[PDB]
Ligand binder design. Structure first.
Ligand SMILES: Oc1cc2ccccc2cc1O
Length: 222
């Protein structure tokens, strides 16, 4: 398959990304608590459902939530201010809460079943969100970093295999603050550092110029 792109909703961020996040890729966004990673995830879950002329892929979404941070009412707001029907947008987001890191790993295998079911339809899965990818692994493997890296490595390999095999954009969030961070090391296809700036602006930079955007009723925008 050719490489598809999903607009983030922000022209600035899209330019930094070469058009949007890529299918057949894992995009990892990392930054402190409150930097806007989950807002970007919510926006992408709407944007992907637009036609390509508007920066989408007419795609379905799968969302794995580890922190109970998915908000359908926020999806509705973004959809209504992106000219989509909110009920239709929500109907094309498959949502699961991961209870712990082992369940999170099983949910990625389950996602493959729904990906296969929709593959030949007019609304194939085009976006898989894992928010937050690292939170359960971090809490469960305190004092056991070597074992944590083993399990994370397999989890990321699973996510790569889905991105490439099924032409999906995988978007993952990772909270990194004070003294923290191996990030995801070199595992993602693309690392994006997100941070707060003056006056509520958000600033994004590729790790390995800068885009500036705001969080609004449209999700994110310049
Ligand atoms: O109905 C489902 C929703 C999911 C969402 C994310 C990951 C896996 C899922 C599996 C389902 O059957």
């Amino acid at each position: 398959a050719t490489i598809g792109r999903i607009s983030t909703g922000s022209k600035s961020l899209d330019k930094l990304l070469g058009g949007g996040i890529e299918t057949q890729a894992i995009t990892e966004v990392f930054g402190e608590f409150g930097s806007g990673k989950t807002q970007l995830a919510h926006t992408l879950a709407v944007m992907v459902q637009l036609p390509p002329e508007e920066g989408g892929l007419n795609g379905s979404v799968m969302w794995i939530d580890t922190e109970n941070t998915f908000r359908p009412e926020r999806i509705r707001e973004i959809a209504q201010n992106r000219g989509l029907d909110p009920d239709e947008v929500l109907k094309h987001i498959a949502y699961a809460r991961a209870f712990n890191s082992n369940h999170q790993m099983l949910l990625v295998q389950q996602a493959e079943d729904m990906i296969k079911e929709l593959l030949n339809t007019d609304r194939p899965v085009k976006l898989l969100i894992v928010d937050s990818l690292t939170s359960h692994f971090r809490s469960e493997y305190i004092g056991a970093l070597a074992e944590r890296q083993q399990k994370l490595a397999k989890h990321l390999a699973d996510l790569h295999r889905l991105a490439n095999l099924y032409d999906i954009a995988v978007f993952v969030t990772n909270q990194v603050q004070a003294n923290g961070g191996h990030i995801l090391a070199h595992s993602a296809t693309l690392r994006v550092y997100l941070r707060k700036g003056k006056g509520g602006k958000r600033i994004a930079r590729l790790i390995d110029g800068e885009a500036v955007f705001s969080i609004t009723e449209k999700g994110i925008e310049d």
